[PDB]
Every structure is written in C-alpha cells, then in structure tokens.
Write a protein that holds these residues in place. Structure first.
Motif, PDB file in Angstrom:
ATOM      1  N   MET A 190      51.267-104.897  44.701  1.00  0.00           N
ATOM      2  CA  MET A 190      52.463-104.567  45.471  1.00  0.00           C
ATOM      3  C   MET A 190      52.788-103.081  45.361  1.00  0.00           C
ATOM      4  O   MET A 190      53.106-102.435  46.361  1.00  0.00           O
ATOM      5  N   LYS A 191      52.655-102.546  44.119  1.00  0.00           N
ATOM      6  CA  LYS A 191      52.902-101.122  43.904  1.00  0.00           C
ATOM      7  C   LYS A 191      51.893-100.268  44.667  1.00  0.00           C
ATOM      8  O   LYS A 191      52.257 -99.249  45.257  1.00  0.00           O
ATOM      9  N   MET A 249      58.502-108.636  33.316  1.00  0.00           N
ATOM     10  CA  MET A 249      57.603-108.607  34.465  1.00  0.00           C
ATOM     11  C   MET A 249      58.187-109.390  35.634  1.00  0.00           C
ATOM     12  O   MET A 249      58.044-108.987  36.790  1.00  0.00           O
ATOM     13  N   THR A 294      49.649-109.109  40.347  1.00  0.00           N
ATOM     14  CA  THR A 294      50.465-109.156  41.556  1.00  0.00           C
ATOM     15  C   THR A 294      51.370-107.931  41.646  1.00  0.00           C
ATOM     16  O   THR A 294      51.505-107.329  42.714  1.00  0.00           O
ATOM     17  N   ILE A 295      51.946-107.501  40.596  1.00  0.00           N
ATOM     18  CA  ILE A 295      52.825-106.337  40.558  1.00  0.00           C
ATOM     19  C   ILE A 295      52.029-105.078  40.897  1.00  0.00           C
ATOM     20  O   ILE A 295      52.484-104.241  41.680  1.00  0.00           O
ATOM     21  N   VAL A 337      50.148-118.875  27.834  1.00  0.00           N
ATOM     22  CA  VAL A 337      51.209-117.941  28.195  1.00  0.00           C
ATOM     23  C   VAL A 337      50.605-116.584  28.550  1.00  0.00           C
ATOM     24  O   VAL A 337      51.068-115.915  29.478  1.00  0.00           O
ATOM     25  N   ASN A 338      49.626-116.198  27.821  1.00  0.00           N
ATOM     26  CA  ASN A 338      48.941-114.945  28.123  1.00  0.00           C
ATOM     27  C   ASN A 338      48.308-114.976  29.512  1.00  0.00           C
ATOM     28  O   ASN A 338      48.291-113.962  30.214  1.00  0.00           O
ATOM     29  N   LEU A 363      55.422-112.267  23.710  1.00  0.00           N
ATOM     30  CA  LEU A 363      54.981-112.742  25.016  1.00  0.00           C
ATOM     31  C   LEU A 363      56.172-113.171  25.869  1.00  0.00           C
ATOM     32  O   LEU A 363      56.201-112.913  27.075  1.00  0.00           O
ATOM     33  N   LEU A 378      60.290-105.317  43.401  1.00  0.00           N
ATOM     34  CA  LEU A 378      59.233-104.840  44.286  1.00  0.00           C
ATOM     35  C   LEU A 378      59.179-105.672  45.564  1.00  0.00           C
ATOM     36  O   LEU A 378      58.908-105.141  46.644  1.00  0.00           O
ATOM     37  N   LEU A 415      50.836-112.273  36.705  1.00  0.00           N
ATOM     38  CA  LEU A 415      52.009-111.526  37.149  1.00  0.00           C
ATOM     39  C   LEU A 415      51.720-110.030  37.188  1.00  0.00           C
ATOM     40  O   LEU A 415      52.145-109.334  38.113  1.00  0.00           O
ATOM     41  N   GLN A 436      49.469-116.488  32.117  1.00  0.00           N
ATOM     42  CA  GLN A 436      50.576-116.294  33.048  1.00  0.00           C
ATOM     43  C   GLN A 436      50.978-114.823  33.125  1.00  0.00           C
ATOM     44  O   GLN A 436      51.248-114.305  34.210  1.00  0.00           O
ATOM     45  N   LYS A 437      50.981-114.181  32.056  1.00  0.00           N
ATOM     46  CA  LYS A 437      51.274-112.752  32.010  1.00  0.00           C
ATOM     47  C   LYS A 437      50.263-111.957  32.831  1.00  0.00           C
ATOM     48  O   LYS A 437      50.640-111.069  33.598  1.00  0.00           O
TER      49      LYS A 437
END
Lengths: 52, 49
Positions: free
Chosen positions: A51-52, B10, A47-48, A37-38, B3, B17, A44, A40-41
């Motif tokens: 874009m910013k 997010m 990618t953010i 899961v980490n 998490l 965005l 993301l 996947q975080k």
C-alpha cells in the motif's frame, strides 16, 4: 540408612520425570502458538508495504 | 507480549493507509496517455533547440 536414601532418590527421580514430561508438552504448545501469531504479523507487514 | 504489541501497532497502521488510498483513486482514470505525452514534449524541445 541405605534404605532411606534410596527412598529419597526414588521420590526425586519420580518428580523429575513427571515434571520433564509435562514441561515438554507446554514448550511444544507454546512454540506452535508463537509461530501462528508470527505468521499473522508477516501477512500484515506485506500488505502495508504494498500500500505504501 | 512483544508479538501482541507489534500486531496492534500494524493494524493501526493498515487502517490509516487504507484511508489515504481511497482519496487517491478518485483522480487516476486517465493514466493511459503518459509515455506518449513525455515523448511529445521531448520532441517539441528537440525541434526548437
């Protein structure tokens, strides 16, 4: 009396070994799930930022 | 739990965005002429001053 105490010691020891083995299997499965899961975080988040 | 909360937050941010980038690309084709326009303007000033 010595035979009774030994019987108690046997019960506790058995419980202990049985619990420890099953707990180690859970801990390993848990840590694996957290890492997945980490990851996947982390994807993301990258990618953010781009874009910013 | 932590998490789960972070990933949800997010994802929401990523969609927001994406909507903003689609509005900005409709304006950009013509960029291949920037460094040239700056130098042109600078040169005109230098000539006047």
């Amino acid at each position: 009396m010595v035979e009774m105490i030994e019987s108690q010691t046997l019960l506790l020891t058995y419980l202990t070994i049985k619990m420890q083995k099953n707990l180690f299997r859970l801990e390993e499965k848990a840590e694996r799930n957290l890492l997945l899961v980490n990851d996947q975080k982390d994807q993301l988040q990258e990618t953010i930022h781009m874009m910013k | 739990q932590l998490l789960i909360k972070q990933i949800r937050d997010m994802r929401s941010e990523h969609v927001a965005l994406q909507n903003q980038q689609k509005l900005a690309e409709k304006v950009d084709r013509k960029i291949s002429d920037k460094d040239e326009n700056i130098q042109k303007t600078r040169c005109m000033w230098n000539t006047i001053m």
